[PDB]
């Protein structure tokens, strides 16, 4: 529920800004992590640093993609820190103990100087003396001003940055803006179909193994059509799979574009030692 | 939801007017940015300077199009800032500290001269002296008058501007409004077919590449029709894509009008060195 | 609504509150029509007061009613007269009981005395002006009815004319790029139904656009510039 994740300000000195940092930074940290995990463009980058094992690719291609990973990942932390600031509860809690008594106004000098830190820190929790009520409301509007000002400024910077990157991304892109639209349409169609056939190819392969065990497979109406229409003969080799996973930056062959590593592999432009073998070489098997 | 997106005046001198600027100007600014991004005319304008890299186009062709895009996307800021001025909260909050107590009338001069700015600042937040409630009501109806007076004028100004461009467009344009209506139909409807074919071409291209991987493609009921009806062989080169990207201004050939760059390229009026190749020259490949 | 009772400044608020919104609405109506832009085509290309006043009054209906509904409330006029040191107190009535109420009766009397003057002008305009124009014109209402319906039906057919022909031309351009068109089932027979032979040059479009006033020859009536084009 919301009450479980609700904000409860600890009206204590040198304590509330720790909580405000944790109650806001951690939910921003998690949403930043989730953006990285769900994005596919980071795993092929990880796969890139895995298979090469030599740092063959330079830093320039990596930097332009790491920005793409972090650029899309950072939407959720930003739109979460935006709303938290616009609420103002987190900021007034955190900076209540740093309000200057000298800067306090709208009231005569009735603000006690005995425990300035202690008295100020309890303002958010309405635990304020009646002689200090105007002082409490003065802080309640002063700190909320800085909270919302930073809230609109952070939207302003982000909205400018989104405009700034996209303007420069098109300008520095060797391709036109309409071929990238076609390229974006192909990559969506390649991934949609590839995941569709992967489910079907696995199911037909799994059904062939289950048939070998029991002698028959209990298949519904739709699963019957898959076996008849789409028959498989064997599994794809590991190097074939490794030749389509990774990072690809618009390589072109004979004046004709290639849009993905799967497209590049299908043109034959991608492809002694035995690895992770179940059993040793046939010469060793004999003995 | 609506509570977060609201105005909350911080009653403080030299601090209330900054909030009015940010809480109103930034929402206007972001809404301005959204319109610029979504409009396609800016990207082909960017693509114009992208491909030439030589400043072939003069200032006059860019002068109209640069203003054309900004004005068409400025609809969101005006329809927002009008509402803020109609409410009047931003203007009364921003100009509260600039109200001259001398100009206040309809009452005996009960306003103290000790801190005139401080007292006037706290009027919007209901922190107003009862003996100055009329002064609050005087200022409340004074600045709110100015908020709407600029608000109504701004609605008038845009209406005059919208008249001025549309009236001046027909007179200065070399084409009749009826023909331009036909031309506007072409551009707004050719792109509907061009984007529809790109999805089908990509889907066929994606299907022709997944088949090379697994040996079969799992296609939906509609998708088999696309493969049978539109079987593709290869792709279109990058220069062929560059010939249909950019700004077009009613170029005519032999008395037959051309309506778009794609039409211009179709007639053949738009179209050795190897760039961004996957692999080097075939002479180097042999070694 | 908001009624700023400040002295020496309410009259500016009153004028802006009834005048600016009225003219803006007169604007939106005249964008919405297409007949006004027809005269723009003729004047740029090259006895025309009859049409100019006709189109202007067609879109002037809604700005007037907002002006009339403004004076139905009557608060706009009472502020201007009351404003015109007790003068501020007169302006501060809406926001000495006998003197303040003495003028207030005159304010509402003056405010209502102007509202029906406009309604008289509209009543005179809609009645008197409409008969004098139609009586003087030699064309009968049956001729006029065929005139308005000729233009009204031709644009609807022309837009249907333009839409189908444009889809034939555009699909030819797309096929030049990819090699096929992702046309739908309805669009499937569209290209085969109408094989276009050529496009219409600029003078052909320019010849049919403009204002036309029965430039008849050979006894066959002509109603629009497109009629004389053929």
């Amino acid at each position: 529920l919301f009450s479980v994740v609700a904000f409860h300000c600890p009206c204590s000195p040198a304590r509330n800004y720790l909580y405000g940092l944790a109650a806001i930074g951690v939910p921003a940290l998690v949403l930043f992590i989730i953006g990285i995990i769900l994005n596919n463009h980071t795993w092929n980058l990880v796969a890139e640093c895995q298979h090469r094992r030599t740092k063959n690719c330079s830093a320039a291609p990596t930097f332009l993609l790491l920005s793409s990973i972090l650029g899309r990942a950072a939407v959720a932390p930003v739109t979460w820190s935006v709303i938290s600031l616009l609420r103002g509860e987190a900021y007034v809690c955190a900076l209540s103990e740093f309000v200057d008594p000298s800067s306090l106004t709208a009231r005569e000098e009735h603000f006690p100087s005995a425990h300035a830190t202690e008295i100020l820190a309890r303002f958010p929790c309405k635990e304020n003396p009646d002689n200090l009520s105007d002082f409490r409301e003065e802080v309640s509007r002063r700190l909320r001003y800085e909270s919302q000002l930073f809230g609109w400024l952070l939207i302003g910077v982000v909205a400018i940055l989104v405009f700034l990157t996209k303007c420069l991304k098109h300008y520095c892109s060797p391709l036109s803006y309409r071929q990238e639209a076609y390229w974006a349409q192909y990559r969506a169609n390649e991934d949609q179909l590839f995941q569709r056939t992967a489910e079907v190819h696995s199911r037909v392969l799994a059904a062939n193994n289950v048939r070998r065990f029991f002698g028959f497979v209990a298949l519904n109406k739709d699963d019957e059509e898959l076996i008849a229409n789409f028959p498989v003969e064997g599994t794809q080799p590991r190097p074939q799979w490794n030749a389509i996973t990774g990072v690809y930056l618009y390589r072109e062959n004979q004046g004709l574009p290639l849009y993905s590593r799967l497209h590049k592999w299908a043109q034959g432009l991608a492809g002694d030692n035995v690895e992770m073998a179940l059993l040793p070489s046939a010469l060793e098997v004999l003995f | 939801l609506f509570s977060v997106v609201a105005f909350h005046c911080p009653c403080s001198p030299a601090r209330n007017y900054l909030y009015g600027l940010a809480a109103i100007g930034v929402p206007a600014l972001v809404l301005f940015i959204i319109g610029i991004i979504l409009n396609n005319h800016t990207w082909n304008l960017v693509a114009e300077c992208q491909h030439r890299r030589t400043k072939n186009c003069s200032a006059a062709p860019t002068f109209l199009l640069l203003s054309s895009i900004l004005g068409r996307a400025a609809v969101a800021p005006v329809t927002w800032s009008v509402i803020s001025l109609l409410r009047g909260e931003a203007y009364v909050c921003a100009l509260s500290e600039f109200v001259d107590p001398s100009s206040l009338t309809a009452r005996e001069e009960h306003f103290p001269s000790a801190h005139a700015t401080e007292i006037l600042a706290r009027f919007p937040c209901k922190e107003n002296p009862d003996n100055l409630s009329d002064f609050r009501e005087e200022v409340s109806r004074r600045l709110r008058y100015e908020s709407q007076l600029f608000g109504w004028l701004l609605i008038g100004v845009v209406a005059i501007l919208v008249f001025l461009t549309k009236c001046l467009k027909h007179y200065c344009s070399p084409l009749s409004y009826r023909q331009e209506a036909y031309w506007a139909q072409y551009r707004a409807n050719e792109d509907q077919l061009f984007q529809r074919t790109a999805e089908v071409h990509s889907r066929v291209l994606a299907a022709n590449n997944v088949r090379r991987f697994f040996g079969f493609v799992a296609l939906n009921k509609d998708d088999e029709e696309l493969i049978a009806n539109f079987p593709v062989e290869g792709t279109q080169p990058r220069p062929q894509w560059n010939a249909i990207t950019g700004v077009y201004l009613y170029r005519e050939n032999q008395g037959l009008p051309l309506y778009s760059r794609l039409h211009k390229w179709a007639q053949g009026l738009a179209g050795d060195n190897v760039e961004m190749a996957l692999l080097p020259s075939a002479l180097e490949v042999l070694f | 609504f908001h009624c700023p009772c400040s002295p020496a400044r309410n009259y500016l608020y009153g004028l802006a509150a009834i005048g600016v919104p009225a003219l803006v609405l007169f604007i939106i109506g005249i964008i919405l029509n297409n007949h006004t832009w027809n005269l723009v085509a003729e004047c740029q290309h090259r006895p025309t007061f009859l049409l100019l006043s006709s189109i202007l009054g067609r879109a002037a209906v809604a700005p007037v009613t907002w002006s009339v509904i403004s004076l139905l409330r009557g608060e706009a006029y009472v502020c201007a007269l009351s404003e015109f040191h007790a003068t501020e107190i007169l302006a501060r009535f809406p926001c000495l009981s006998d003197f303040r109420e003495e003028v207030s009766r005159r304010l509402r009397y003056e405010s209502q005395l102007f509202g029906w003057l406009l309604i008289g002008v509209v009543a005179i305009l809609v009645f008197l002006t409409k008969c004098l124009k139609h009586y003087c014109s030699p064309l009968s209402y049956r001729q006029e009815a065929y005139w308005a319906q000729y233009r009204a039906n031709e644009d609807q057919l022309f837009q249907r004319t333009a839409e189908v022909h444009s889809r034939v031309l555009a699909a030819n351009n797309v096929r030049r790029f990819f090699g096929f068109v992702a046309l739908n089932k309805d669009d499937e027979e569209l290209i085969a139904n109408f094989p276009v032979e050529g496009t219409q040059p600029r003078p052909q479009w320019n010849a049919i656009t403009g204002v036309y006033l029965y430039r008849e020859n050979q006894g066959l009536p002509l109603y629009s510039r497109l009629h004389k084009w053929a």
């Binding site: - | - | 139905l72 009557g74 009766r105 005159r106 509402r108 009397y109 405010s111 209502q112 005395l113 509202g115 029906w116 309604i119 008289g120 009543a123 809609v126 009645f127 409409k130 008969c131 139609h134 009586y135 009968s140 209402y141 049956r142 009815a145 065929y146 319906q149 000729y150 039906n153 031709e154 057919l157 022309f158 004319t161 189908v164 022909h165 139904n193 109408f194 276009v196 032979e197 497109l226 009629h227 053929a230």
Partner: protein, 240 residues
């Protein structure tokens, strides 16, 4: 049910009945909206005279302007043909002037419009208190009391009898005007049944032919244009 409504619409009795109802409804709202019985000492009869006559005659102009039969009458007028125009004018007239008499009757039976109009014309000879030999304050207070001035000065007895005498005279006028209008409607109806060359059944036939003739020609005129555009488009781009 819709067919029944259309048949009722074909009957002018419902049109007149509905028009009177909206005029009464609009009048009752408007009398309490911005009338106020304005208290002008100098010239207050103008306000009452304006509200008594002008709103009524405005709907007369509205009735004439909203009907196209008068347009054909004036075009021909600017014998049997002239005589038929008079009958056509007579039929349009009945629906044209029905609304103002409803407005005139309702306002005058209300009484408030004429009390605030002819108050300055009241006579003070019956009242020994309103001597006022100066001849200045008498007219000031005379235009003052009926508007909003209760004036608790033992003169209120004057204003009720003035109001009651005004109210009574107001009722007699409308009922006489309504009776006069009814007699005028009767005799004009009698003139239209005597001078008309048509019979009691032939006139209905002629009117039926007129109403049937406008619609048939108008729909055929619409078809004639549409059909011509269809060839024009065929000659224009080559499709139908």
């Amino acid at each position: 049910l819709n067919n029944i409504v259309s048949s009722l619409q074909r009957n002018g009795i419902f049109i007149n009945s509905l028009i009177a109802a909206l005029t009464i409804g609009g009048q009752q709202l408007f009398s309490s909206s911005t009338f106020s019985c304005p208290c002008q000492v100098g010239k207050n009869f103008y306000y009452g005279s304006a509200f008594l006559v002008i709103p009524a005659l405005i709907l007369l102009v509205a009735g004439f302007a909203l009907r196209s039969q008068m347009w054909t009458i004036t075009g021909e007028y600017c014998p049997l043909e002239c005589k038929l125009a008079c009958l056509r004018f007579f039929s349009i007239t009945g629906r044209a002037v029905i609304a103002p008499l409803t407005w005139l009757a309702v306002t005058l039976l209300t009484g408030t419009y004429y009390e605030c109009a002819a108050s300055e014309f009241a006579s003070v000879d019956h009242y020994p208190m309103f001597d006022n030999v100066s001849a200045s304050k008498r007219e000031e207070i005379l235009a003052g009391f009926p508007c909003c001035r209760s004036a608790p000065s033992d003169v209120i007895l004057v204003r009720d009898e003035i109001a009651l005498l005004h109210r009574y005279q107001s009722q007699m006028l409308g009922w006489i005007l309504i009776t006069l209008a009814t007699i005028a409607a009767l005799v004009s109806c009698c003139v239209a049944k005597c001078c008309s060359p048509l019979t009691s059944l032939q006139h209905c036939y002629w009117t039926s032919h007129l109403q049937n003739e406008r619609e048939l020609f108008e729909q055929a005129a619409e078809q004639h244009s549409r059909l011509l555009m269809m060839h024009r488009i065929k000659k224009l781009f080559g499709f139908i």
